[PDB]
Amino acid sequence: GVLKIVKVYLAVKRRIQPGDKMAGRHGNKGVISKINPIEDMPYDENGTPVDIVLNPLGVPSRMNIGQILETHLGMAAKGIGDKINAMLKQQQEVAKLREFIQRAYDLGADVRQKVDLSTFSDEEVMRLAENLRKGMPIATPVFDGAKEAEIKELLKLGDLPTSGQIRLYDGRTGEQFERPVTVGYMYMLKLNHLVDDKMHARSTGSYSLVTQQPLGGKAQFGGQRFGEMEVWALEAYGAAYTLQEMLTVKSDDVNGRTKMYKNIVDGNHQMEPGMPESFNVLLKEIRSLGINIELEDE
Amino acid sequence: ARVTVQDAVEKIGNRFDLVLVAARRARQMQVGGKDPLVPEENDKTTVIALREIEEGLINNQILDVRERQEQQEQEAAELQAVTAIAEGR
Amino acid sequence: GQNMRVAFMPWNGYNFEDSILVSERVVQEDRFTTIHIQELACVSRDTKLGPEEITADIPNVGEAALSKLDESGIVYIGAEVTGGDILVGKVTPKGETQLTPEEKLLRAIFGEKASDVKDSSLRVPNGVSGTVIDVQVFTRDGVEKDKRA
Amino acid sequence: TEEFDAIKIALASPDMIRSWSFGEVKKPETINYRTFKPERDGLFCARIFGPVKDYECLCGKYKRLKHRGVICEKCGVEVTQTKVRRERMGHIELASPTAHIWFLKSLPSRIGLLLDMPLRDIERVLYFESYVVIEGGMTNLERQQILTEEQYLDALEEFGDEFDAKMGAEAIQALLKSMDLEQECEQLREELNETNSETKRKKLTKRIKLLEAFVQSGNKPEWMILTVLPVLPPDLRPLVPLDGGRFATSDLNDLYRRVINRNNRLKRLLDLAAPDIIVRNEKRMLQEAVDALLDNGRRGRAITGSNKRPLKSLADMIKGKQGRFRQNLLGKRVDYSGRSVITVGPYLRLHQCGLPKKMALELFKPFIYGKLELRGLATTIKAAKKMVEREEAVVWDILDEVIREHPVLLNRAPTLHRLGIQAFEPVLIEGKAIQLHPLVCAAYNADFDGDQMAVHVPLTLEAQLEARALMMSTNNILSPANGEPIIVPSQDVVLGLYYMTRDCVNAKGEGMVLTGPKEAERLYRSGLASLHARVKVRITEYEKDANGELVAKTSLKDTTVGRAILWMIVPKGLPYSIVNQALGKKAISKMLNTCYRILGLKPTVIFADQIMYTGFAYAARSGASVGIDDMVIPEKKHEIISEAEAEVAEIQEQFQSGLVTAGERYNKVIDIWAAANDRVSKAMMDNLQTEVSFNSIYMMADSGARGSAAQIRQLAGMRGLMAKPDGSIIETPITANFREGLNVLQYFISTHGARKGLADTALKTANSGYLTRRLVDVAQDLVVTEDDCGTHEGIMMTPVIEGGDVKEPLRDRVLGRVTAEDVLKPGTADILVPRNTLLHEQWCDLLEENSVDAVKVRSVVSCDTDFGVCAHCYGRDLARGHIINKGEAIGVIAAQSIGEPGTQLTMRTFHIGGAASRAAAESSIQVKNKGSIKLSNVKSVVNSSGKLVITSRNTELKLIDEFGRTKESYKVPYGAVLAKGDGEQVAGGETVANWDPHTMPVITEVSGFVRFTDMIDGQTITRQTDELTGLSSLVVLDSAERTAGGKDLRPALKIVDAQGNDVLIPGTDMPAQYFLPGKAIVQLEDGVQISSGDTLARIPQESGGTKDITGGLPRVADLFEARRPKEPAILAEISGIVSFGKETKGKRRLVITPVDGSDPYEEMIPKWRQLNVFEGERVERGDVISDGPEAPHDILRLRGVHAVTRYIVNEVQDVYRLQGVKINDKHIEVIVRQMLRKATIVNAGSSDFLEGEQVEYSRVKIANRELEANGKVGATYSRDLLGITKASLATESFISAASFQETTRVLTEAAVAGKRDELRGLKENVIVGRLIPAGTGYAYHQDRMRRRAAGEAPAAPQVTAEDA
Amino acid sequence: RDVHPTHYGRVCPIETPEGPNIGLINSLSVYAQTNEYGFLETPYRKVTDGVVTDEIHYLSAIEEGNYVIAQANSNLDEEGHFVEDLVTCRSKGESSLFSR
Ligand SMILES: [Zn+2]
Ligand SMILES: [Zn+2]
């Protein structure tokens, strides 16, 4: 640039507000509706209210059963593979846990394949937790990993529900929730906010030179366009004054934006739409030519 | 929806006409002063004109009040001003 | 992303098509609070009356506007700015057409730098309100290293 | 003020220009950069236009308010508001007038046809160049003939007069003034018809459609030459600097400064001398200047220094040469608007909307000021402009007090139909997203992933009130397209109610039906507390509905309460319970249709809020959560798969041995897998509806919500098959599914068909207003203006059965359309005088389809009203359910209902892609049920073989019972034998038809004698021997096996009587001459008597078909835009007898014998086109002969008017009816008339034959002359079918057709003709900036309001009038 | 835009952006890599007889059709034995059952 340039970077804490779009890793893209308090929202029998609620109807239409498999994998994660690193690893650290893990493990998982805390010692279990250290939250490949038979078996090894679904309670009523539901911990993801996400508020800004169409920029936000598609909309309805001022008093017409504002601030209605700027400019572009357009009365 | 829209619609020969009546009624409602329905039970909160038309009192015609000579809708305007005390600009 | 408690169930109209309902605890804690950075460049070009200047001397403003600004027009680092506060202290001359016979007399008496320039600084866009994290420093040698550098 | 009746466009005359303009501009003097005051006497002057400042004078003698009216003495100038300089105009008296490039470059030369000169040559020769053309005078006899340089004639006298020899645009004037129009009209009407020469009749017939244009009410051609150049408004072209050093000025300020400088010098070369080699050099520079304001690029574009961009000319601002046209209609940036993410609003009703609070602080600021001075928030209007203009919290209250009764308008960018912009009551909601009503989400084709909708704010109260009774969403519950509501409970809402009204069934043995019997109630009463009868079973016994829920709460009862609680809560907020009881899953949309009809509009409003709340409420009370185990796998799955994997192994082994060949081994492997998916899919549908009726994933697919019988199969059982991107199906099916482990192979295969779908809407989301544009710009001039017309002319007969989507469908076409006359068909029902029939009426016309062959119904295509359209011929469609109202744009609501469904259509290639179908037939028709046999269009006759053989193809063979209902559908070929005739009763399981699936016997239809014609041994016939017959007879050779010279010879058995004369086929005048194809079997002698039904020839082999069918979006644009189909079918130019000429494997022929000719009428038929024509009965003119589409142009010239308006509107629906979209015929015919509004009459009445004018003006001329009196004149005419891109290209209005890229040929037509443009349409009314005629614009709606008090009051003034 | 059967293990047939462009871009897969002269060569574990070797080799798109390559969805204990003699294997577009 020329004559120095001062670039100030502004940082605003973008909290989670109505309008933000979030989605997981299956394709279930959605946008936050209303931030409902922890009051109305349901909750388990052991507290821990539900954080995020989705729509089960997004499965029949949107073929993505995979997202549900992750749900059963998140809830039962306290008894599948993470159990080996959430109990057998914590028992070696705290001496007040080694007395609970060795007993509460066999009662849940009696599989010969799994590590028997009762048989193996402190040294044995240690090395049996290094073979799967990288895969802390279990491990599942792409097209060759989990299975309908393997999963179900791994759900009966740890706490707590059976088969998957579990009986909850309504946050509003509080009574027994008719028939269990599928719950757990799904890994979702928040999507960044583009410049377009920033609210575009405009009422009275600057206008162009050749045309009387409002133009935004730095301070004043750009006005929304009213394409022909939107024109045929109001054109369809019986409304006449609505679409009339739409391309007159609103935008182009210069003598319209002035009288209108001076009338609303008084308390009365705005004077009937006279001659739009579009009617003037266009008309003048004809007189200069060989042809001529002139308005005629009754 | 809106109160008695059906009954309102029935009140007029043409849908588009009912809109013209209410609009014109709203116009006079502000300018001259206020309306025919008030004391016993009228609207509540802050509100608008259709409530009147739903009622029997109003009369909307093609040319209900005019003038003998020349087309002057204006005679109506004069009488209204004389009668209605609240004044607009 | 993160790991939260999910419970698939048609709540009450909200989760119609592709909607998402989250507890009020999500806003009470900065678990989804991300950092956004916007760049507002301000360039001063040559005016018909002469090159523009970058100083804190900007009329037609309040005290809280020039308060966060230094003696060069550029706001310090770590200012709790908001919608209306000045970020860049840029000035721009007016013109003989925009000048009045009253401010023309004092122009050749109390000095040229009295009432020749007007107000034309960069402010904060309506709606957004954050803080300054990084300021840009530049000073051309041909324009002399003033109080800025 | 008064309502604008109509505007008129015409050429500006010199005297007319000096009427609005004052003074005269001589020098290009603008305004300085210092002072804004006028400089000299140029485009900016105080005297000419007006001052600039307040009341001060240019000089400075008097500025005080002392002298406001009286002007100065030294310099008298009347000072007024600077606003006067805007409206006031000025003119520039040009020396030598110039021409307009619009009336020159245009193909239809306005001066080339009128004046006998080269329509393009001479133009670009005398204007710009120096080629002199004599005007007139007493010099040179050549008044029309032009000359050059050496051909310049001069007076060879001692003292001759001055020669008026000019060139360019100034010369054209006299040439036009020397041509008498009247003299060119009288000789015109004679030359065309009289003279036999076709060289002269084709030259004057074209130069007349413009000649009479000036003779009529239109102005004279002597106004096309621009003599005076009007200036451009001062303030319209400011010179204020932008930012820094860059300037933003119009491209006109650099053009007008050029024209003037090239004018004041020309004046000096007029009064004095005017040499041909001096004046030319002057206008040569002036012409190039004025052309800059006209058009740049048609010859020489004007570029700027170091910039290849032609200056934006005045005309370039309309047509958009640089491409600004796509930005002009892109959308005018509204001052009051916004945009943000959308969301769902449950508690939010259809009457309100949930918009942000901070957004209201900006847009709604004007309504705040006028409310602040009432309270203590703000003091004055001025001081309030620096407080509520930004972040303020004191306004939160006052602002909400204004949003009490002032709804706004929501809108999505892709606006298809009318529901693109609805009105809702704003509600202050925290956040940034806008709450959109769930039911309304159906109107807007979008989801909630990131889509953003705008929002506007009604200013005036007039446009605010009409936005709550005609614009509000809850008001228009019915779609413009059909009578089916768009807004309707979709998923989460219907899921709650569905789960409620269900009955669970588990372990049950004894039949428990307590509802009715008396012993059952007691028996299963104590059994409930026992161990036998369970609780979750079928049992109903108690008192009322309210008391029933009381028991169901104590774990005593379960069901029989959900149906009771829902049958009292809903009808609580709204009476009429007789109708309120049908919810279901498919009746969820039928309810919003039946409630409005019986009840009203208001009742429906609150009726939608009730179902909404309880719709999502019980949706959580039940919890229809979907899981992995919810996808119950059929136990019959592993069995079908095993049997499938064991079948493919056997086939492979049979190929190694020698059993199979290469045909039965392909269709066997693909078949066992093409059905394996269907079996396992249905295995789960009938397993859950008997074991567990309360399955989440199942119920959410069974009811409404979102579920398909194809997407569930994939996840549940196995995903059938996946085809390649091309179309060829893969021979390697996929077994693994979504549930189990899906390998990398099968996942890759499904990707092929997954790329198409998402790649389709990719180009539609960019500009969905492309398809709609082609339709809206066409029928935008259709406005409702019904005045008890009742035209019974051009009646359109509705065929009892549609054309044929496939080969023999069965549907009806009549909905909400008024009948033409009194038709009596039903045994009880009876449509009297023209009355708007309902939806239940069409079922009646469809019932007795075996009696009626044509339904009399008034159509839109045939209406008396020219511009607008009556209400009768139209229908009920509008915005509600009642009859169509006056003042409606039935043209924009019809075009928008076609472009919207076009987004769901398949987009491959505009010129048709292709498909894959198989042709099969069976020679066995065994009736299933009982009844009689119905036959249509068939000529049965008994032959000598004792067989009831028919003589026609495409026979409707269906089983019509005693109630008249279609139960069966068969296709009877040609030469088939029917066991029983028409009307004869039949029994169940009885053969009623039997033919040979190998031979197509060529049977005659008349009796007499056989005569060998055009058959000589060694030329066309040769002694051959069959393979099945064994009898040696004469066999006709092939077309390729024939000798040289026998290429024109065509063998045939011409049938003659006893007198030797020709025998005509009954019904028409078609000689009986059946041609004998090659390799035919002729087992008949010569001169031997025969009878009707006797076989002549035989066709050993049969073939044809394979590739055909179009369908999809591409075809849509192919119909509206009449073009050349992918598989053109050669229609029949003449209607008569039909008989194949050849049958050779190479080429097949088809010959028709009208009257005199026969052989010349040969039609080549390849092996691709499937023969749909027979060899007997007479086929209609324009009938389909091949298996493919037809040409709207050719078919129009053949059949008649009752075809095009019944075919182009039918073939289009055959695409939407497939996807599920139902569109009424009303919103399809209104656009068809426009493609036919132009035609060419054959019998001249007022104008000549070749004109190509409109048909509306030609319909009235023949109406008053015939119907009324004054010698009925037969003003017959011929239809003319065009495209939507051409029919709209040349319309009556000039602003309507200006929406294309040809704004040069249009504007000139409506100008030279002096046509009065009565703004009827709405699209042509928005651009001008007038008031929409639909409103309320309609003249019809003039009306004032009264109060009783006000009513007595005028009486008081009337009373005063009486004199004493 | 439509992925071809030959594009196996060299590019993900479902990694194209969602919006204005669908199938016009599509990123590059994992193990796939631009070798020397354009020809994309995806790694393949050379397995001799019934013993799988841990060595990797980059085969050309035209060389792959010359040899039969097994799949990854096959059961393997370690790297010296094979589960079943007959296991689903793929060639260059077709599917057949080959032995170890
Ligand atoms: Zn003066
Ligand atoms: Zn009609």
Side-chain angles (χ1 to χ4, degrees), chain C residues 12-53:
Chain C
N12 186 7
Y14 293 93
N15 57 2
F16 195 89
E17 295 293 349
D18 297 356
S19 301
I20 298 180
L21 293 177
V22 62
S23 60
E24 185 180 0
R25 187 65 177 182
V26 68
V27 68
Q28 301 179 2
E29 300 180 356
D30 292 10
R31 53 177 59 261
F32 287 92
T33 301
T34 183
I35 301 179
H36 178 272
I37 304 179
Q38 180 180 1
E39 181 179 359
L40 294 71
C42 183
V43 181
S44 59
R45 300 178 181 87
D46 298 355
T47 310
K48 302 179 180 180
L49 301 176
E52 297 180 7
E53 300 179 359

Side-chain angles (χ1 to χ4, degrees), chain D residues 949-960:
Chain D
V949 182
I950 47 75
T951 58
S952 181
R953 190 174 299 179
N954 299 357
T955 302
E956 181 180 357
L957 195 286
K958 299 180 179 180
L959 180 57
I960 302 300

Side-chain angles (χ1 to χ4, degrees), chain D residues 935-955:
Chain D
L935 300 177
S936 61
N937 298 357
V938 56
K939 300 178 59 180
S940 60
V941 55
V942 178
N943 60 359
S944 60
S945 300
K947 301 179 181 179
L948 184 58
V949 182
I950 47 75
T951 58
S952 181
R953 190 174 299 179
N954 299 357
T955 302

